[PDB]
Design a protein around this ligand. Structure first.
Ligand SMILES: O=C1Cc2cccc(c2)OCC/C=C/CCOc2cccc(c2)CC(=O)Nc2nnc(s2)CCCCc2ccc(nn2)N1
Ligand SMILES: O=C1Cc2cccc(c2)OCC/C=C/CCOc2cccc(c2)CC(=O)Nc2nnc(s2)CCCCc2ccc(nn2)N1
Lengths: 410, 405, 407, 407
């Protein structure tokens, strides 16, 4: 028998001429993007064939085999409904409803501390999905660049644990939420910052990455890493934000000096330069779409879902998801872990990097923040999502009442 | 095409007439115990048949026995259970057991002479999967008191009966942070897993009846969770708990002061109730079933009864994660990443959601009040298997995944 | 000496009329009922029988009366007392009184409907100087409970009997600070200081260990009597019952103190709570308490009797801790602006000491947000505005401030 | 009367030799270099130029010299000074000095090489009474940096120039409590009090706003000069450089203060830090600082010059906060046992005030666990053991305590 022919017979649906657009529509509905890096060979071959074939454009069983041979494994999984979310079309319908519902939540205040963060409209609201299989969906303003800000903190932590290991990184930074208040103290009882998700801790993590090269190269090292995570979709940098970050960052300077005082950095740190590096990393840009891929990498045990690259060690992914759970959302972390139960990280731009382990990554973005510094619409959507689907870290996969389970069906 | 006869062929392995012994040994190896409540009909029918003579079973006789329970027996035999190769897995649990056995550190709680009576050499581990597959090693049939292990169970009951929204009017939902205080910033105890919080939870259950009936209500509930296995009560522990519980009295009075209990609570009675609930007895085996119920979305795995609402199970697992192990909670959630609850008797109620429940018991506690061997075992377990809450199900590194075959 | 005083009081003319001597004596601030004046007054009473007539003293007859108490009478008349112009001073106290009277703010403790019984309009101020000069204005003879005002008194007793070193094994010596009066124990597992509930409860357990609560109470009461020069010291059983029937916080403290092994070996903690509640229910009037305060002002000698009541060690320690921990959450503010050893109580009492000058008791039931008598606190501020009494005022160069110790 | 004093000093009219008058004068505790004695000593210098074989003042010649300063000289000689047996008293200071000398424990601050340069054997004690009577023992003329001793002085200046109300908009008035300056700010987002680094830094930003750091420093120096009656005040640039090179903690505080908008509008925060570091690097000797302390003891009048230097408002506020916040983590213990307004510095200095009696400066580089001079702390304890100087001692009834104001 033949896998290619088996798929041909599936897609054929009654002829030996599967029209090209018909194959494309079938492929798109699996949630896969036509532009999937893992589908390049197949799409190149169809483009070629559309050039050489007599106008018409209907593949022979033989011609179809010619196109899909290269990528047959992945195409089969997609078509034979084997993906983590089999009925992806229905699911995106749900994401859209959740999107529209959160859209109505107009409260919140746009971060005003930079006239840059201030530049964005409060009406921007975007949601991007990327599953662990590379199935994609977006709604709203998902192609508008914005800064990660604190969303970057778990990513740089992952990089540090990836390169240095858990044991070394946690010599410098604790592993638990502060509890004590919001961001009040810099250090816990051991004279370390409480965890990697707090400013003090992020600043220390920053000082562990790529020690002994200049900030230009350090930045490149992190950016290349971020590129892998996003499957080479948009990752940029706002110098505007960077300038404003350093011009107004008195609190961070205070933290830096105190960290110096208490000998919190690795031997021979340049403590003013680390702050500069810190400010840069917070000024890196994403769109909803590219960040959702980053989240999906974390969802996928450190493999970028749309490229198949191993990006982070599973040790780094686990540690990062652990600390995103418990420390991810500033003062709301406890409440959030309790009600939503998802590893998530917020940013002052209005971003929420969200992971549903073994299912998907997401990025929600709406500039208006709540009292505690979390995107209003983002937080509303996170609640709704977990209301709707049995995704919450301590939900049951067998008994979950009136919840929908998107991994079931097909 | 015959559901029963199909399984008969499978068990038969050719030679017509599956011997009794051989069917029993095949059944036991799926991890099921012959005393499974869901296997009652089948085992009753085998007992009947084992009276009618003084041998083997026809495809007709086998069908006679297994017809009643064919669904469950098929799943077991067609290796469909959460852990397919359960025989291999128990081998691993045994290794983990022996390894933790060698950890002789720790101090037995001597604050009550009842707790001080126990030997530091006791060490037991019981497994119950969400499918009712069981395994034990060491001293798993020795009764001991839940103590603080009871806190999540009573909380589940409260949320089950009253709902999340009401219960959390009285008790917070997050870990405290500092070791010391009774109340958080909102004048509620920080969460249900702390003494102050447990005491308040206690005052929400079965309001408006006496302590005798309240206790019965909790017992009935505990019975469902354990699939009617051993649940007892140590009056000895209870007396010592009340005679020496100055701290708890202090908490009670402060809770009274700050008007923390529901309208017109008798706070000294609630303390009495509290002391009783901490003095309830389990064995490793029975408690592992309770844990398995929590693992199983509130359905008792060995009976199939709906015991707790999924809301109560989620909330309880959430708070066990983050507040379960006193001062070690943060470290534990980080390294082990399993909902767990410890008790001063040396108990550790452990849940791996969607896989199994466990109870580990060794009386010697570490500096922070957690069973030495229990804590060592929990670490080992997660070292070995991809069970940690944020492990990846697809890419995990030279970790074993017991759900795969 | 008697003759010298005779000539002084004489004012030349006839014989000194008896009422004239009485008016002169009263104006020195002394009360005719001074215990240290007993002999003199008895003799004048006798004489005003035994020679019934015009009722004027011979130089010889005056000598007959005053010989017994000539020392004290001389000091009073030769303007040698701590406040020489006492008549003028009381005029000032009256102005300060009236000014504080106009402060109508504050809420009366309702937590016992026994405490709730008092009118918010009650307001009294009593002065007793280190020399026994007295003055009162407003409702100074109305009995009220010390409540927390008793805490320094019992502490003094404990340090008096046991010494500083032993007592401070059980109780700390500094203000709490820690987000107000929330925790029971400091970092050493002791209550922060004797002025806090937790600390007072522990102090209570150090006094007269090994006798029953009836006798313990008597022991403290006899002590309190000496301090007040045997003026009114009473007990409100009503308050006591309400104190025990609603004191959940104190019970919480008791149990925690038990837990943490904070009491002396073999304490009955529930009995100590009972004792505690009793001591808080002891009654004073403004006048009698002002004498107690004056004893503290006077290095432990009761000013109106001359009895040695407390060791100087106990008086110093108590004044030290009244300075810094005396007024609950307001202690810091109070020490800064008023700079007086003071202790407040939920009845509306403020036991006030100006070391080396006088003791005072101010009472107005309405309390401010922090639990201090509104009018009491207002008066304390005014007093220190007016006179250079603040602990760190200068005795040489002060402002437009009046200095009542100067002529 | 000059003639009156001549007879007093005469011992027996025979013409009173020069050295004999000088010896008599020195014994009152006054130094011949007293600024208030300039006229007298100038006249004696003139007269001692005329003859060449001794001098032996006439009655009219003595009158010629002393007439200018007769008031002050009389008070000194007619034993009217605050301590009127000063010879005996200095004997006691010497004993206290020798006793504290034997306390060899403690660690010299090595955080700056300048502080590390000092010998642990240095130990000096200087007394200046509110009347200008002086005494010294040990290494009292060796310059050292005030460091934190400067904090109350700058605060006084700020309150002197701006008033209490304004200054306390920026800085709190109570001790930190939480522990030893772990937090920067209290609940109101102000540093807890002027004695903490955070608070001192803010106080620094209030003085002489709107001029450059050169002039600001000059302004403070001029003020310091007045306080010390123009005795030694200097500056260690070495210390200053080390202070700024290694003061990461202070920078941390600076940035946090900036963040929380704690400075007056349009402060240059990095410059205020620079100013701060300078002020901590100002040099004194035991002797000159003891005069500064005496000014605080004397309601803001420099005892050796009679100049009004600080308003009594500033002096009271400063003494208040020295009481309660003066000695870092030991403040509470110190206030309790010693009961004197005092301020320590990491150089080993302890600026000490006994209000209405005297100022002192003790210096020994070795610090205890909490950052206070070992010998300094030991001496303060001894001093209060010996004399009834403790803030809550009684002036009439004290123990086997000596009272140097009596005679
Ligand atoms: O352990 C010690 C000695 C010690 C040692 C090292 C460090 C220390 C203390 O610093 C403490 C750090 C302060 C945190 C305040 C949170 O900040 C807040 C602000 C506003 C409101 C609140 C908290 C909530 C609240 O009321 N919590 C309380 N819940 N129960 C209380 S209060 C009183 C019952 C008695 C239980 C109890 C508790 C403590 C101690 N003694 N007894 N003392
Ligand atoms: O916000 C305020 C006013 C306020 C408001 C609400 C409650 C308050 C006080 O009570 C404090 C409640 C907690 C005490 C934890 C005791 O338990 C501990 C014992 C030992 C160590 C530690 C904690 C950790 C630690 O100290 N880290 C740091 N130590 N110094 C730092 S960091 C650098 C200054 C941080 C910047 C800063 C400075 C001042 C304030 N806040 N932030 N003050």
């Amino acid at each position: 028998p033949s896998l290619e022919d088996l798929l041909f017979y599936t897609i054929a649906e009654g002829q030996e001429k599967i029209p090209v657009h018909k194959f494309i529509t079938a492929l798109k509905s699996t949630g896969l993007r036509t532009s999937d890096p893992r589908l390049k060979e197949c799409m190149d071959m169809l483009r070629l064939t559309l050039q050489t074939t007599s106008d018409g454009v209907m593949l022979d069983k033989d011609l179809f085999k010619k196109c899909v041979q290269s990528n047959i494994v992945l195409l089969t999984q997609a078509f034979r409904r084997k993906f983590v979310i089999p009925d992806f079309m229905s699911f995106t319908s749900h994401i859209d409803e959740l999107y529209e519902s959160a859209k109505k939540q107009s409260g919140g205040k746009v971060a005003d501390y930079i006239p840059q963060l201030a530049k964005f409209s409060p009406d921007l609201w975007g949601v991007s999905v990327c599953t662990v299989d590379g199935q994609r969906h977006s709604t709203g303003d998902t192609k508008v660049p914005f800064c990660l800000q604190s969303c970057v903190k778990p990513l740089k932590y992952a990089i540090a644990v990836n390169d240095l290991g858990t044991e070394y990184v946690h010599r410098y930074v604790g592993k638990e939420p502060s509890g004590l208040r919001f961001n009040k103290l810099f250090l816990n009882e051991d004279d370390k910052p409480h965890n990697p998700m707090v400013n003090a801790g992020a600043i220390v993590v920053t000082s562990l990455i790529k020690q002994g090269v200049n900030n230009a190269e350090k930045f490149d090292y992190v950016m290349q890493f971020l590129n892998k995570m996003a499957g080479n979709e948009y990752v940029g940098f706002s110098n505007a934000t960077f300038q404003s970050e350093r011009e107004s960052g008195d609190r961070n300077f205070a933290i830096g000096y105190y960290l110096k005082e208490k000998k919190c950095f690795p031997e021979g740190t340049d403590m003013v330069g680390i702050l500069d590096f810190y400010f840069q990393l917070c000024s890196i840009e994403v769109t909803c779409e590219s960040a959702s891929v980053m989240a999906a990498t974390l969802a996928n045990g450190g493999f970028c879902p749309i490229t198949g690259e191993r990006v982070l060690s599973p040790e780094a992914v686990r540690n990062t998801l652990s600390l995103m759970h418990s420390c991810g959302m500033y003062d709301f972390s406890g409440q959030f872990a309790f009600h939503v139960g998802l590893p998530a990280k917020s940013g002052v731009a209005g971003g929420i990097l969200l992971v549903v382990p073994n299912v998907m990554g997401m990025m929600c973005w709406s500039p208006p923040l709540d009292k505690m510094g979390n995107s209003v619409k983002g937080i509303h959507f996170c609640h709704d999502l977990v209301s709707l689907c049995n995704f919450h870290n301590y939900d049951n996969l067998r008994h979950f009442a009136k919840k929908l389970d998107p991994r079931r069906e097909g």
